[PDB]
Amino acid sequence: VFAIPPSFASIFLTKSTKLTCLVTDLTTYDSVTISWTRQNGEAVKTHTNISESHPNATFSAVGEASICEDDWNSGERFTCTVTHTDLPSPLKQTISRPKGVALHRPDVYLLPPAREQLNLRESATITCLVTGFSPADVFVQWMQRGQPLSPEKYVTSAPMPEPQAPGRYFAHSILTVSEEEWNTGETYTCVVAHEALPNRVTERTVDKSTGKPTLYNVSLVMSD
Amino acid sequence: VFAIPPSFASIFLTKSTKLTCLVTDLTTYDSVTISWTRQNGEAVKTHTNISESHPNATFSAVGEASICEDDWNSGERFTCTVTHTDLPSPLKQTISRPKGVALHRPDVYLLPPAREQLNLRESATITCLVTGFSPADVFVQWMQRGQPLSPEKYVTSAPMPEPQAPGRYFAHSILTVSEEEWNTGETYTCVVAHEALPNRVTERTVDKSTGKPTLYNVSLVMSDT
Amino acid sequence: VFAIPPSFASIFLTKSTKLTCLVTDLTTYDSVTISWTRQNGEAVKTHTNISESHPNATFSAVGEASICEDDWNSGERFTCTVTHTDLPSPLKQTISRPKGVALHRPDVYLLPPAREQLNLRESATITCLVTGFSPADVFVQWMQRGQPLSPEKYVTSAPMPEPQAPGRYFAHSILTVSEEEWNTGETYTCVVAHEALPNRVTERTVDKSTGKPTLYNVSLVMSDT
């Protein structure tokens, strides 16, 4: 039983707590009885979709269901309870939110693309710096002029431990853009969804003029 | 029955979807029969923190229920039933989340205080003109470098209709601060919450340095001759 | 066989290809023997750092053997063979460098810390953006004033595929350093190592004066009343 806990990025991106149950190393048995349950074993929410053939060269299914938000936010456990003849007993591989961690709010610092990149003019990379968050999960998206970009446009690194603070984690998000989009001056906004934020999302924006000084526009116009 | 459907400000700020069907204008008795019938008539949840015996004689039956957000977002019909001991006919009040209202995002513009106000150096007001949003309520909150301010320090306006654009709404939110805090450059972030933004929440930032234009356009021409 | 190939970070930092093996998930129980093939049958040398008996792979041993740097590239097939009550004959766990990969030169940027970090004054994070490479674990090593900094101070991202590139990949390397150390000059340099580099190393430097303009030194001074 490899039932997946509802990761926070999935429950924030879809606004629906999906608890799935992909039973790995399954056989050629389509009679799998996936009977979901909790510790309060009543009004159980069954699956709604069936998966297909997987890299294990057999037939498997999924146990995707819609649960409420505040049960997992409180810490209510769930068990897929895969009742099968191959298992000797239905395995009670429960999934929940084990609490007991601190809640450090991330501080996102939008790093503009380097001047060495902008001289090469073939591309530009804007790196969001999500750092100092004690739960590991962040859901980072990029929005340009108020409209979110494609998921293929940006890549978010998996959160790795911070050097100085062991409890805090850092993460990265690179948005690769063409250089002429950057010299246009369009504002690129980084939205970071991490749970310790008071509004549960912070937006910071970046544009070519955010490194320029506000008061003095000191130009250097050459002459013959 | 003074039934109050949950607005967005109660749900977003609390993070809790609580519904109230408080009965009023009747002396407090043991005739509490509110049961929160769903679209199928199923019961939901009991109520604990009942109302008081006011001079107006309000009933102590609040009908608080921590109803699921994943149940309320579908917007199905909720009917309150009050099967009174004297009157067996229930007081049927239907309520559902309205759907099909045209989702337009707010255009939060945070306006710094006027120079005529900063000349007084006694109280400064910072206003966010959340404007252009059509689906009814918005929740405006003020944070200062990640620390939210007290609700007794800011007052948001009620959502009034837009002057020129039909079917929209606008909402002000002022923040009465002192000019020492404004002059020291303390960043004030008006953050709004509305179910029409792409991420349902946007923030805007204001500083003393935000309003200053490029006052000194130095043009160092060299090697002319 | 739990064989760990020495990736290019190991063969660059230690200057020696260390043929890490283990008897994990082998039916051998006690007094294991290690055998290695250089594809001519002559590669094995028993080394130190032998781990001890734990319930998975009892009486374990590593298969570390110092074969030169050219050979791993030249594609010697490397198997770790134990002759006991586990399988002695099949040694199909043969691992060498892949023969043809799209070698792409890591064109590396040093992104200076954002001004918000320097305004927080607690720490300054310098990211060594490495983009465009076969992921040979570019060994992104950080040296300040010639001497290498500690491996604890810098954290390097595992390589992840580039979004707008088919066979190029990116990496990141953050050196978390104090804000006072950044302000006072203190060039932090960044070397990133890869096979596709012409000298196997490119380096870049960053400072407070890196993003500053060079012909004009424009300052701004308040005589505040």
Ligand SMILES: *[C@@H]1O[C@H](CO)[C@@H](O)[C@H](O)[C@H]1NC(C)=O
């Ligand atoms: C600021 O200087 C740049 C330098 O080329 C110029 O293009 C721009 O028009 C200037 N803006 C203002 C507002 O003076």
Ligand SMILES: *[C@@H]1O[C@H](CO)[C@@H](O)[C@H](O)[C@H]1NC(C)=O
């Ligand atoms: C600022 O100076 C630049 C000199 O290159 C000039 O082109 C621009 O028009 C000036 N802008 C203003 C607002 O004076």
Ligand SMILES: *[C@@H]1O[C@H](CO)[C@@H](O)[C@H](O)[C@H]1NC(C)=O
């Ligand atoms: C201008 O130059 C002086 C000394 O020549 C230096 O102290 C100062 O930092 C420079 N200004 C800026 C903005 O770096």
